[PDB]
Design a protein around this ligand. Structure first.
Ligand SMILES: Nc1nc2c(ncn2[C@@H]2O[C@H](COP(=O)(O)OP(=O)(O)OP(=O)(O)O)[C@@H](O)[C@H]2O)c(=O)[nH]1
Ligand SMILES: Nc1nc2c(ncn2[C@@H]2O[C@H](COP(=O)(O)OP(=O)(O)OP(=O)(O)O)[C@@H](O)[C@H]2O)c(=O)[nH]1
Ligand SMILES: COc1cc2c(c(OC)c1OC)-c1ccc(OC)c(=O)cc1[C@@H](NC(C)=O)CC2
Ligand SMILES: COc1cc2c(c(OC)c1OC)-c1ccc(OC)c(=O)cc1[C@@H](NC(C)=O)CC2
Ligand SMILES: Nc1nc2c(ncn2[C@@H]2O[C@H](COP(=O)(O)OP(=O)(O)O)[C@@H](O)[C@H]2O)c(=O)[nH]1
Ligand SMILES: Nc1nc2c(ncn2[C@@H]2O[C@H](COP(=O)(O)OP(=O)(O)O)[C@@H](O)[C@H]2O)c(=O)[nH]1
Ligand SMILES: [Ca+2]
Ligand SMILES: [Ca+2]
Ligand SMILES: [Mg+2]
Ligand SMILES: [Mg+2]
Ligand SMILES: [Mg+2]
Ligand SMILES: [Mg+2]
Lengths: 439, 423, 440, 421
């Protein structure tokens, strides 16, 4: 039995984190006070859910998680929330003043003083582990903390937990959803610093989740709550292999074995279907072939891009609910000759498939209708390089005039770290061009 | 907890400062005696930013009152909300600065500065997590202009990392007290370009015009001008005083609004200009960007916008708010810099100020502000070329070399602004 | 605080002093025995009128004033007059022998006998002050005491009070009134000596006041009593800002900033309006527009010169009475297009306006009609150098033959002091030329 | 507090001196017994200028009578107002002067100057604040001429910063007493040019003519001449004795009347001998000059005019301005505004309104030329010099007086021709 410790950094990770653990609890039948009648072994046991929850003599299940934010205002809502009693107080680490959307301030100035305390709190959790497989880091690209403190944490984790795996859930910035002007800077700065300390990273583009909430859920002005409930559905689909009995993606190293053939190109694309409005009293539930066919509609991807003008290096279909292997082969047969699925020539053109018979759980009073079958597709496509190209261009525009640089240099960063990070990104895009395109 | 210490210096500094407290005290339901009498918890959730809580559910403005003459001090202490201010925080001298920057900055002001710093230092010790300081003052007199800038330098020496935020009233021949205001103002702009992180330029000329030309007031008083200043001040601090999606403080504001360090002078705007007929959200955004609503006499069209922040207050369609903002931008994109992507931000707030169903407040960082400094500079040189009225300053120990420096430093500022207008 | 000590030197200064204080009393409701029934603060207070009146335990209000003259006959009237109980005897200081129209006698021979005593009485007054603002010095140009002793007192005051401000109300000589042949000498002498010790001087040309009393007041041959009552109205308008509180009132030290571009150019030109008689006031009611316009008529000026032939450096309108800003502004715009207000190029072309709500008073049995609104314009104009020129020419006519110079040398002066004073006047005239030339 | 010490010396001195007290006592309401019997408060305001206050409101002239012969003061103490005079202040000799300047200045007069001095000193200690002295004497010869100028010189050594004022009567042969009068006049003018601040030149030549031609007197006496002298003396001292709008003493008059130290000899005038226009006009006419000089043969350096009686200030101002403009040629340009005018409420005895004239005019050199002509006629032939050398003098002293009087006339010319630019 191997454990997984989750780390939530900054406002975006803490709230996304709040949402996932709310969902993990509903899925495993754990009460808001940590009780679990489903569990017959009190105070222990080697069940599949024990990878994300530990137990006490009192029969209480506690997420193997740590929340860190450099100001208390967001974690305080977790300390007085519905699952307040589910978290031990030391799992919640808050600071005095935040990083002011400043990567330099979060990584260098405020980060230096709070890093050791966090690593102790993490150690406290690793000690209770008998086979830690590694960490899941939730954070934004744009926040000064989400970008700056995370990359220092990822650096340290590689030292104190060498052999272990680090997986990343990242929120790519989009102006439709509360973004500061300097967020492009923090994004490149943190991507460069963390690029070698993360084995696999799932980007979520707030622009994409935003439109999905508008199109499919009929929400005029989606809020963080709407966005995070849809995000934690995707996250829950990705981690369920770890929390439930199964054979595919049973530990963090299979994500990299199945999804990441080249190390730097460790950015899979999540598509997800079906997203159905709970306000639709009736809505015929789609077939397996239909939900599978939707995984290839750009509308349903966590990042807006066009996978048709790219190449695949790996696809992984994860179904939850009423799905028979027979129907899955049928869809796949069809979607091959229907859609444009280019695979890179040094990779088999195939699909690793997983089926979990327990169907998606929905937060009561949430936006999502319950569905008898859903699928999540993790594909590694050069198409995602589009998100790097858009981001790098915005970086170029401001950096050419040196706008806002003085704020970073003022926290102790050297102006040259901008050029280094950007030069790395300029290489990252090239790695995608050489892998994908041809003459 | 993001506490802000407020300092108001000089006649103008205290009259606009005093109105500011009257307005926000009202919006938060604090009565003149400091007892909460509102109806919503929203009014008390950020109350610790500007008010210190005394025993007895009493709220006291975290404000320090400074002047070299005892008049306006007594004027406020007997005004509407005069009792709400902490008596210990009235620091005032007897001599007066005679509209002389040198008197406020070097000779008379120096004797009183340490007294003010002891109150500043006292209010800061009382802060869980000091955010920064904000100062109201005029630039064309002596106490606000000179002692003000002197305090800003002494405070930056002891609090080198807090944020320094001033509401600075620029002088105009239309509303003038003495002829030496360009002298007092040019010496002060120099200090501000070096020791403040954010400065709202509140131009008395613009105020005059708004009253005269728009509000149809033949004979405007300082009371009419200040009505506009408090409206603006209330709107600019909305996100500090009320809850909303926006988890931001003054530092986050400076990081995103100031692309280059010396260019931290903001153009404020307000709509509707103070009604039975309600305004429409298209109308609020239309006026907010109109030149006639800017509290600084500069035609935004003469230059480009580096950063823009708008704050809408009222119970309104956030969708329509957003649609209208993208229209303006797509309707004036030749007046925004293309090299700062997505540089126009909007915050909405449900609490509308007392008297209006809904309103907008404009905070712009624009190269057009150079027109304001050019104006100050033109009127400075006219007199300085002939060394008119210099004896009021050289008799307080100052030398001409110091005037030459301030003037030079100001022209550079105008040059910097114009270098980013041709990007 | 902000207290003013007023020093009245010699006959002109003493007789101007009587008029002024009689009027202040009538303006504030102070009786000739010093009782002020309206004043509720007994023995003290920090009220506006207290800048000129101290208080005693008995509720008496005593002028912050010293009267000094080198002979008694003129003060003796103050000592035995209607306001005799207003001043303490120690405030009224006289010698036995005057200066005989001789500056040298007032500044040296006689003056030295009494200067110490005067400075001691001034000190005693200054010690009763919480914030002595400065001194107001009333004297003539032409008398031996007015010119000689005043210069001595000013020099000593700079030594005892440093740069504490000193304002002069000076009487410029005119032949029509009552002038001695040597008055051009005492004039250039004292002007030169006091120049570096005076922050601001208000000259009143006797020939201007005399002509106004005739044309406007219908007085065949004006006397000193006629001139002083008019002079005191001007003095009252200038100090009104110090003695009265008001929403729209501006302090005189604020005008002083706009009225002194350079230290030596500290001679404002005063104009006053309306100077009308009760016979004529019974018909006409004079508006803000009319009295404002009247300030730009050359014939209403305390000094005889032509402002149309000069350039302005500052213009201050001091209104008192039934006056509101809407009308002031409307008036100034009219003037601003019908008249030749040419300004120098190096200072703004505005008008600085104060408004005192307390209306003008008139002494019972005076010659001025009681009016609802008055104005006094304080302007700084190169035109005023004309007075210097006229006085300098008379000086030159006599000095070219050393006429009467032996009287001055007999008392201890040197011809060198004459030419020195004159050359200063020469520079002063050139200084007025240069401020008027346009910038490069 | 502006006391004046009156001194009268010699026959003429005490004669015109006695009349001066008759007239000004009558004007102030002082009877011969010294008791005040007037009706106005103006009469007692400046009384202390010429009078001391004795026990029981008794006013005593502040005067000192001096003569080298008892045969005159004997008369003075007999005339009306002879008891008014304080009896100690009589200081009379016995031998006499014999119309000999030298006897009065060097020999006889010296034996007696210490006696007068003690009296002048005693009268001075009495004064709250002494203005100066006024001397009525005569350049005609003897006591007043030679001794009077000795007193001036002795008083001057003890009161050097005080004002020395003389009423000096010039000799004329039409009223002549002695032949040697030209000799005595010149010796005195030599003294007055050096030791007085202001001197009124009362000229017996002009007084004779006024009586004869104007007042049509065939046989004029000293009584008649002196009556003119009194009228003038009452006039020139009006603003000293009454509280007019003028606030001035002897020193303030000197300062405005004497542009150069030696040119301190004045030409008195008086009118009438009736409106403001004629009264002003006669005043600038030669027929009213108490000195045989035509104002139109020279130029006025300075002029003072006092009008007494009830009249309009404005007309006075206008008439005085018109006279100047119509006579502009006869005033120097280099002294701006050199004509001053006072007006006094109360008139003289028996006149509805009078006007007195004090001119400092270069035409006065005619007076001096006249004496110089008669002097140089006698001295040329050495006539009568033994009278003087017999007392101890030498011709040298006679030459200095002449050469000094020549220059005095020469100065008056220099400024008459002086021009301005
Ligand atoms: N999906 C999602 N995005 C969020 C959420 N909160 C913030 N973001 C996004 O994350 C970025 C801002 O990062 P934050 O988490 O607010 O920043 P932080 O880590 O607190 O950093 P500092 O506040 O600068 O110390 C913007 O692009 C936001 O749109 C959230 O709950 N959900
Ligand atoms: N307006 C006005 N001018 C006056 C008055 N008294 C005198 N003068 C003028 O002042 C000048 C003379 O100065 P005075 O004041 O008389 O002389 P003083 O200061 O007493 O000097 P001495 O007596 O010579 O020591 C002349 O030009 C007079 O016209 C007065 O009451 N009013
Ligand atoms: C405390 O109040 C404010 C604080 C801030 C902002 C602001 O303008 C709406 C405020 O109201 C005045 C702000 C504005 C400007 C930005 O750049 C244009 C930005 O990206 C960033 C912002 C704010 N962030 C966002 C996404 O609105 C944070 C700083
Ligand atoms: C004691 O009485 C007199 C005293 C004075 C003057 C005078 O003549 C009118 C007197 O009456 C005889 C006098 C005369 C001459 C002046 O002008 C030459 C002058 O300027 C000055 C004056 C007098 N001053 C005035 C203004 O008249 C002061 C001296
Ligand atoms: N808007 C406004 N401007 C003012 C006010 N009071 C003074 N001013 C302006 O400020 C300048 C004078 O500064 P002031 O505050 O009087 O001087 P201080 O007391 O020495 O700081 C002039 O330009 C005035 O027009 C006021 O209440 N409102
Ligand atoms: N007007 C006038 N002149 C006199 C009188 N007595 C003498 N004189 C003249 O004075 C001159 C003689 O001087 P006087 O006083 O007699 O001689 P003293 O007594 O020796 O000085 C002659 O010119 C006389 O005409 C007099 O009473 N009146
Ligand atoms: Ca268990
Ligand atoms: Ca009182
Ligand atoms: Mg945060
Ligand atoms: Mg002011
Ligand atoms: Mg006097
Ligand atoms: Mg004889």
């Amino acid at each position: 039995m191997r454990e997984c410790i989750s780390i939530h950094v900054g406002q975006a990770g803490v709230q996304i984190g709040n949402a996932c653990w709310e969902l993990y609890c509903l899925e495993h039948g754990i009460q808001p006070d940590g009780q679990m009648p489903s569990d017959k072994t009190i105070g222990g046991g080697d069940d599949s859910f024990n990878t994300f929850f530990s137990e006490t003599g009192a029969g209480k299940h506690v997420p193997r998680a740590v929340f860190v934010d450099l100001e208390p205002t967001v974690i305080d809502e977790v300390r007085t929330g519905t699952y307040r009693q589910l978290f031990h107080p030391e799992q919640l680490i808050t600071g005095k003043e935040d990083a002011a959307n400043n990567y330099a301030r979060g990584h260098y100035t405020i980060g230096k003083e709070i890093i050791d305390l966090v690593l102790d709190r993490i150690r406290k959790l690793a000690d209770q582990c008998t086979g830690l497989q590694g960490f899941l880091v939730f954070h934004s690209f744009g926040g000064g903390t989400g970008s700056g403190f995370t990359s220092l944490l990822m650096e340290r984790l590689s030292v104190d937990y060498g052999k272990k795996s680090k997986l990343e859930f990242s929120i790519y910035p989009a102006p439709q959803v509360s973004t500061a002007v300097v967020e492009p800077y923090n994004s490149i700065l943190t991507t460069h610093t963390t690029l070698e300390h993360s084995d696999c990273a799932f980007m979520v583009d707030n622009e994409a989740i935003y439109d999905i909430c508008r199109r499919n859920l009929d929400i005029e002005r989606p809020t963080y709550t709407n966005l995070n409930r849809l995000i934690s559905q995707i996250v829950s689909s990705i981690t369920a292999s770890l929390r439930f009995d199964g054979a595919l993606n049973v530990d963090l190293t299979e994500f990299q074995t199945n999804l990441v053939p080249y190390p730097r190109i460790h950015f899979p694309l999540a598509t997800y279907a079906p997203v159905i409005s709970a306000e639709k009293a009736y809505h015929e539930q789609l077939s397996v072939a239909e939900i599978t066919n939707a995984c290839f509609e750009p509308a349903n991807q966590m990042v807006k891009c066009d996978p048709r003008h790219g190449k695949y290096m790996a696809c992984c279909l994860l179904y939850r609910g009423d799905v028979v292997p027979k129907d899955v082969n049928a869809a796949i047969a069809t979607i091959k000759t229907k859609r444009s699925i280019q695979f890179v020539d040094w990779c088999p053109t195939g699909f690793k498939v997983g089926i979990n018979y327990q169907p998606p759980t929905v937060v009561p009073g949430g936006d999502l209708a319950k569905v008898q079958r859903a699928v999540c597709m993790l594909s590694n496509t050069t198409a995602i390089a589009e998100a790097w190209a858009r981001l790098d261009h915005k970086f170029d525009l401001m950096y050419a005039k040196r706008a806002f640089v003085h704020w970073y240099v003022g926290e102790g960063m050297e102006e040259g770290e901008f050029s280094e990070a950007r030069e790395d990104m300029a290489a990252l895009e090239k790695d995608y061009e050489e892998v994908g395109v041809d003459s | 907890m993001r506490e802000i210490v407020h300092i108001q210096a000089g006649q103008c500094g205290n009259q606009i400062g005093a109105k500011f407290w009257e307005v926000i005290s009202d919006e938060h339901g604090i009565d003149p005696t400091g007892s909460y009498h509102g109806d919503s918890d929203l009014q008390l959730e950020r109350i610790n930013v500007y008010y210190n809580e005394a025993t007895g559910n009493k709220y006291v403005p975290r404000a320090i009152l400074v002047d070299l003459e005892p008049g306006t001090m007594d004027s406020v202490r007997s005004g509407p909300f005069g009792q709400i201010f902490r008596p210990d925080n009235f620091v005032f001298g007897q001599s007066g600065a005679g509209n002389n920057w040198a008197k406020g900055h070097y000779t008379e002001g120096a004797e009183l500065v340490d007294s003010v710093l002891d109150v500043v230092r006292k209010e800061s010790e009382s802060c869980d997590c000091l955010q920064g300081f904000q100062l109201t003052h005029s630039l064309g007199g002596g106490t606000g202009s000179g002692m003000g800038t002197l305090l800003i330098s002494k405070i930056r020496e002891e609090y080198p990392d807090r944020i320094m935020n001033t509401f600075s009233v620029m002088p105009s021949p239309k509303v003038s007290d003495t002829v030496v205001e360009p002298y007092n103002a040019t010496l002060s702009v120099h200090q501000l370009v070096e020791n403040t992180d954010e400065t709202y330029c509140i131009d008395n000329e613009a105020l005059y015009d708004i009253c005269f030309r728009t509000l149809k007031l033949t004979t405007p008083t300082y009371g009419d001008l200040n009505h506009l200043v408090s409206a603006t001040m209330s709107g600019v601090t909305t996100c500090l005083r009320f809850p909303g999606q926006l988890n931001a403080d003054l530092r986050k504001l400076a990081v995103n609004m100031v692309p280059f360090p010396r260019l931290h002078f903001f153009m404020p705007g307000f709509a509707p200009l103070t009604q039975y007929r309600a305004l429409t959200v298209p109308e609020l955004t239309q006026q907010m960007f109109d030149s006639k609503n800017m509290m600084a006499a500069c035609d935004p069209r003469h230059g480009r916008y580096l950063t823009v922040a708008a704050i809408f207050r009222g119970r309104m369609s956030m969708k329509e708010v957003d649609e209208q903002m993208l229209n303006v931008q797509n309707k004036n994109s030749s007046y925004f810099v293309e090299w700062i992507p997505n540089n126009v931000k909007t915050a909405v707030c449900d609490i509308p100020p007392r008297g209006l169903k809904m309103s907008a407040t404009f905070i712009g960082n624009s190269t057009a502000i150079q027109e304001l400094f050019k104006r100050i500079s033109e009127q400075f040189t006219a007199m300085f070329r002939r060394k008119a009225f210099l004896h009021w300053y050289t008799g307080e120990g100052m030398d001409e070399m110091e005037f030459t420096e301030a003037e030079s430093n100001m022209n550079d500022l105008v040059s910097e602004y114009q270098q980013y207008q041709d990007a």
